Enzyme design. Structure first.
Site, PDB file in Angstrom:
ATOM      1  CG  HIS A 228       5.458   3.931  -2.861  1.00  0.00           C
ATOM      2  ND1 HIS A 228       4.268   3.530  -2.293  1.00  0.00           N
ATOM      3  CD2 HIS A 228       5.444   3.447  -4.131  1.00  0.00           C
ATOM      4  CE1 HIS A 228       3.548   2.877  -3.188  1.00  0.00           C
ATOM      5  NE2 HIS A 228       4.216   2.837  -4.316  1.00  0.00           N
TER       6      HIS A 228
ATOM      7  CD  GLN B 277       1.343   6.381  -5.242  1.00  0.00           C
ATOM      8  OE1 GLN B 277       0.304   6.978  -5.229  1.00  0.00           O
ATOM      9  NE2 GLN B 277       1.454   5.129  -4.829  1.00  0.00           N
TER      10      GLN B 277
ATOM     11  CG  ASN C  68      -3.032   7.794  -5.926  1.00  0.00           C
ATOM     12  OD1 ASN C  68      -2.353   8.796  -5.951  1.00  0.00           O
ATOM     13  ND2 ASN C  68      -2.506   6.569  -5.772  1.00  0.00           N
TER      14      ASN C  68
ATOM     15  CG  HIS D  66      -6.282   4.304  -9.753  1.00  0.00           C
ATOM     16  ND1 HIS D  66      -5.101   5.031  -9.714  1.00  0.00           N
ATOM     17  CD2 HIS D  66      -6.398   3.711  -8.542  1.00  0.00           C
ATOM     18  CE1 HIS D  66      -4.527   4.853  -8.540  1.00  0.00           C
ATOM     19  NE2 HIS D  66      -5.281   4.061  -7.813  1.00  0.00           N
TER      20      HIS D  66
END
Ligand SMILES: Cc1cc2c(cc1C)N(S(=O)(=O)O)[C@@H]1C(=O)NC(=O)N=C1N2C[C@H](O)[C@H](O)[C@H](O)COP(=O)(O)OP(=O)(O)OC[C@H]1O[C@@H](n2cnc3c(N)ncnc32)[C@H](O)[C@@H]1O
Ligand SMILES: Cc1cc2c(cc1C)N(S(=O)(=O)O)[C@@H]1C(=O)NC(=O)N=C1N2C[C@H](O)[C@H](O)[C@H](O)COP(=O)(O)OP(=O)(O)OC[C@H]1O[C@@H](n2cnc3c(N)ncnc32)[C@H](O)[C@@H]1O
Ligand SMILES: OC[C@H]1O[C@H](O)[C@H](O)[C@@H](O)[C@@H]1O
Ligand SMILES: O=S([O-])[O-]
Ligand SMILES: O=S([O-])[O-]
Ligand SMILES: O=S([O-])[O-]
Ligand SMILES: O=S([O-])[O-]
Lengths: 576, 574, 52, 104
Positions: free
Chosen positions: B406, B404, B549, B504
């Protein structure tokens, strides 16, 4: 949304909710607007620390506080970062970035000043200390008659205390509280008085305290409703209030201009009475955006026409802070009544005391708690029970010690959190100074730079005045160092220090009260009505014109109650 | 007293069961140990306030304030600068809620839990990628086409529930700058796209991030909008045990503790669903006589659900931030004819609308022109309110990590004021961890947590071999890929995050076809082996090594589990 | 430490760190004036700050 | 293990070491002042490729030590400054100060 109400209140903090309490109760058709949103569960505007999870994890609440305090005025950043990769875009100047305020002198700021935009305002996060001010800290409500003045304050404070559910015994069963309280009483015997901090709170069990908030004052539910069928109240969250429109006479407010943040639309709201309770900073901002005082950098070569004292004579308290680790002598004293046989963990180990013995230094309940902890937790080397509530001690401001004190544990944005030293040992010390009002200490608003809601950017021009305020501030530090040592030494990492100016969040005098606009250099009268205007009232700490060290919100509430009496006697609720 | 279905936990997986089963006419109760915390929209994303969308940095603090550590070892830091009068310890004794069972060197120190209605979906970053076959549990054995079709249907429905989309950030100059440069640089060898995000844009400056609330609004029913549905939510209710019959074929009750009154009650249902998170589902099961309580003892293996709490997986996570390259910044204004010096009378910035030789479309050059002309004091060509980048290249066998690239708010996120925020890009790469029997989540038989439940303890190391080799290759891949956009931002240098800070965790009560052969606790309907009426939902079901994810995948499993329930239990007449 | 003690910085720009937690009684600057041997000729952003 | 990678910098006329006509140093000599940036093309592109190389190569040995993560060091901490009184064959053509015998 109707477009006409009897009363409109800007701000749903505890002060706005004092007006709502009084005026919805008296039968007025009321609307209240907040720029922020509903944020504390089903109890609207309630204290965010009133969850089971935060009372089991008080240190985590510090993060909740930090997340809802938005800095008022952030100067342009001049830190040098010269370890960027050569390929990264690199500045040639210290240009305006990240919402900073190029109007702000970094060396004449209240850098720690912050505001909270959520329904309930700062009362969703505050530490609930509600002391009264003594005469030396308090403005006069009656001239030339001190006993009348005192009587009026006692009436209003007594009412304010009821609204907030203020009390002084919710911590009376704490061993740490009493240990500290009693030690300080003894060390200053006959020189200073110590008591529990008056706290706006109601204990619900040995491990749960319902901290008060705006919700306590007024539940913020739309009315009419089942419990209140003849009352009328509407709360409108996510609505930025932008201006009150003055008539050309400057004798009345004609409408309130608002911006609905969710739809984007702008409307005009009409009321008979307008009440601004947006906080010390935002009251002032709204009034300046409405033609009161003066927009832009102060220029004494053309003082404003309307409310020339607005945003002058601002006061913010000096704050000093440290933490201590409880002395060995104090810890051993907790268990002084115990007879100990054997070694912890052995089958013969015995911790006993004699209930009701004349030679005991503590009451039976204390000894039973210590004995049970020592016996049930033989791996633990301290005599203080695990669930023992926090200490909550004060010696209130007096002439010989002209600062407020809080000797306690609670969560605040600058709060400290470590894991190495047992929490039962740790006490916070916060001493709060009083600041003389001076004309040169200002909160003003840019005529070019705008904030995140497109309103004129607040800017401070502030220094602590150089004589009494300064000399008291340093004597206050000294006092903290002297007094805290009776309890224990400082905790490494939480050494005695001044906090960043305005981190304390007790700003006052931005729209200050007095009897006469000119003689008393002020903006509102003792009914909190803006001079000249028949139907505009301000509430909050910006009304307080004096130098005060105690926490100001109870005093601001007392003024708003008095303000509401005036409204009740001069405006007629619409028929329902 | 009695319900058709009772659900433990109001996060997004619990709310998947509620959505499905309330919708199908069942009388449903849901219990959460935490309280209502996101405004009038129950269980909604806390970041959906105007204030937080104007101050996204501040939301990091909100996240920090609701993540409570799972297992904190006894503290052994030496403080030797106390005053001689201060009470000074002689040993490193248990304090401040530490866990003396925990080896500090075999922990997931960063693991934490959130106890609020909506669970971690009140704070999450809304990334909802699909797992590719390599990362994905099998639902059908020995027919890859049928397994694909099952997963495609379930994911498509889960994406509807979360309102997943891949377009909400298309008008961001930063986004495009970063995505376009990466695609060019990889010369076809990798695919970049927008992170699939559970969100709906409301305006150029406001995004409604999804949450449990988006899945199911958590309003009690019947109500005016749903006069024939039956749902009650009970917050501030600590769910402590499910009672097994002697056959170990059915659950007979749920034992709860009402935290406000202090009283304990039991609740009867036809169907029991545990969706309390990967840690707390395992805790509730162990406290109920599943698996083994206490320090693992192989000489006396548990007779029920012996794989419970074993084969736990947590992703390796690497993080850095970069400051955008001078090349990329100059590229933003490449279509402009610029004359004069900013701030002076003669300065001008122009472009030709519609020119086929422009690198950028008109909406971009108009934004850049107006920023540059209206803000001559500003040295950057990027508009002040430009939305955040949201870029990914998804896991593939040749780069077996999720990415990611971002800007968003997470608990370890970084906040600084010296470098302009428009230049800063976050890089997070997530590694996959091989499931290994020795990697365990267990619960003490003597130490208890703040809710008087057995204290969780980890015994975890990242497996040697492939997991470790990949984790380090992943770090290098982040250093190589980020360099194409700019250098590292000082203070946010490339690093591995504390084990478990990624949140996670999977495999704690893992899924498979056969209890013994697949070393697992639930079947493909998420039903606990042997039990007619007990289902588990959440990431703890996922038995594979995965880097993406996990929530979208856990929701897809929960939908399949609901289909089994609907097939096998009849709702009571309303 | 021996190395650090014998490396004297070549050109140190004027310091603009904000210290706003002085006691009110302490002498407090109104400007970022030249102090502690700093070099007011030096642009802090075009330097070799580590040169010694 | 320590990893130190050192880049080469293109000589550019604009990169200067000059001395104040008013400010003096601790020995009362004209205060040195720098006007320096790493040149924007090859020097810069190589510098970042050099970082990448360190990250790639160091990983063959072990992961980074927390607290000693990959970073550029402050400009000039390296103490390899050159070309302040530079050598060439011809003062004018080679933009220089001393000849190949190091004579001014
Ligand atoms: C954050 C914080 C604050 C305190 C404390 C600890 C902490 C961690 N502690 S101790 O640690 O210091 O000790 C205190 C304590 O113990 N005792 C005390 O008296 N004061 C404390 N405070 C200060 C009090 O909270 C403060 O005095 C009162 O809340 C002031 O009440 P009020 O005057 O009602 O202001 P507000 O800020 O709460 O609310 C204003 C509302 O206005 C809204 N608003 C603002 N602008 C608006 C606009 N333009 N349009 C519409 N609405 C618009 C805001 O959203 C807000 O809700
Ligand atoms: C905090 C956080 C989490 C994430 C993220 C960023 C951040 C900042 N980001 S990214 O940056 O990581 O990438 C994510 C993202 O982009 N994508 C993603 O898929 N996952 C994200 N997570 C992780 C997901 O949030 C997580 O996978 C799901 O929320 C899990 O859903 P669910 O299985 O429903 O669990 P929950 O933890 O949300 O809710 C459990 C509820 O159970 C309650 N509970 C627990 N014990 C109970 C008991 N004994 N009795 C009663 N109730 C009891 C809890 O109160 C909770 O409400
Ligand atoms: O379970 C029956 C139905 O319940 C709901 O209405 C869900 O929205 C839907 O997707 C589901 O199919
Ligand atoms: O006795 S108390 O510490 O459990
Ligand atoms: O309006 S007058 O009373 O100040
Ligand atoms: O009894 S049945 O559930 O195996
Ligand atoms: O219940 S089943 O797995 O026999």
């Amino acid at each position: 949304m109707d477009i006409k109400y009897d009363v409109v209140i800007v701000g749903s903090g505890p002060i706005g909710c004092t007006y709502a309490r009084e005026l919805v109760g008296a039968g007025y058709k009321v609307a209240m607007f907040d720029i922020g949103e509903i944020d504390s569960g089903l109890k609207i505007g309630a204290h965010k620390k009133n969850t089971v999870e935060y009372q089991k994890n008080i240190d985590k609440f510090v993060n909740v506080i930090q997340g809802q305090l938005m800095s008022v005025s952030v100067p342009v950043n001049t830190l040098v970062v010269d370890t960027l990769s050569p390929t990264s875009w690199q500045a040639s100047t210290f240009f305006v970035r990240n919402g900073s305020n190029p109007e702000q002198d970094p060396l004449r700021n209240l850098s720690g000043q912050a505001v909270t935009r959520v329904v309930g305002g700062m009362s969703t996060a505050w530490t609930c200390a509600t002391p009264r001010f003594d005469r030396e800290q308090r403005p006069l409500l009656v001239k030339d008659d001190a006993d009348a003045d005192d009587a009026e304050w006692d009436r209003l404070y007594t009412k304010a205390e009821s609204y907030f559910q203020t009390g002084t015994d919710q911590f009376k069963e704490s061993i740490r509280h009493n240990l500290v309280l009693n030690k300080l009483t003894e060390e200053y015997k006959g020189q200073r008085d110590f008591q529990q901090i008056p706290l706006a709170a109601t204990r619900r069990s040995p491990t749960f305290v319902e901290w008060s908030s705006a919700n306590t004052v007024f539940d913020l539910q739309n009315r009419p409703n089942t419990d209140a069928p003849e009352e009328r109240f509407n709360l409108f969250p996510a609505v930025a209030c932008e201006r009150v429109v003055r008539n050309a006479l400057n004798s009345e407010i004609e409408s309130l201009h608002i911006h609905d943040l969710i739809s984007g639309d702008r409307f005009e709201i009409k009321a008979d009475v307008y009440v601004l309770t947006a906080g010390a900073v935002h009251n002032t901002q709204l009034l300046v955006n409405s033609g009161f005082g003066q927009l832009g950098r102060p220029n004494p070569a053309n003082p404003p026409e309307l409310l020339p004292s607005l945003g002058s004579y601002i006061t913010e308290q000096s704050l000093v802070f440290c933490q201590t680790v409880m002395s060995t002598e104090l810890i051993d004293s907790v268990k002084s009544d115990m007879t100990i046989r054997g070694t912890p963990g052995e089958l013969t180990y015995s911790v006993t005391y004699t209930p009701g013995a004349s030679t005991n230094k503590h009451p039976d309940w204390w000894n039973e708690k210590v004995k049970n902890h020592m016996m049930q937790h033989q791996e633990d080397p301290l005599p203080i029970p695990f669930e023992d509530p926090e200490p909550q001690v004060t010696t209130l401001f007096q002439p010989s010690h002209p600062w407020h004190t809080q000797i306690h544990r609670d969560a605040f944005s600058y709060g400290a959190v470590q894991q190495s030293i047992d929490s039962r040992l740790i006490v916070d010390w916060r001493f709060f100074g009083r600041t003389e009002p001076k004309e040169e200490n200002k909160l003003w608003f840019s005529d070019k730079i705008t904030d995140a809601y497109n309103m004129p950017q607040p800017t401070f021009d502030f220094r602590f005045p150089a004589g009494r305020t300064s000399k008291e501030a340093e004597d206050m530090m000294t006092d903290m160092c002297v007094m805290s040592a009776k309890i224990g030494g400082f905790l490494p990492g939480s050494l005695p220090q001044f906090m960043e100016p305005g981190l304390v969040l007790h700003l006052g005098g931005t729209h200050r009260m007095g009897f006469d606009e000119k003689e008393d250099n002020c903006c509102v009268n003792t009914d909190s009505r803006v001079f000249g205007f028949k139907n505009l009232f301000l509430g909050g700490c910006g009304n307080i014109p004096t130098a005060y060290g105690a926490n100001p919100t109870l005093t601001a509430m007392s003024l708003a109650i008095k303000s509401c009496e005036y409204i009740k006697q001069n405006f007629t609720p619409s028929p329902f």
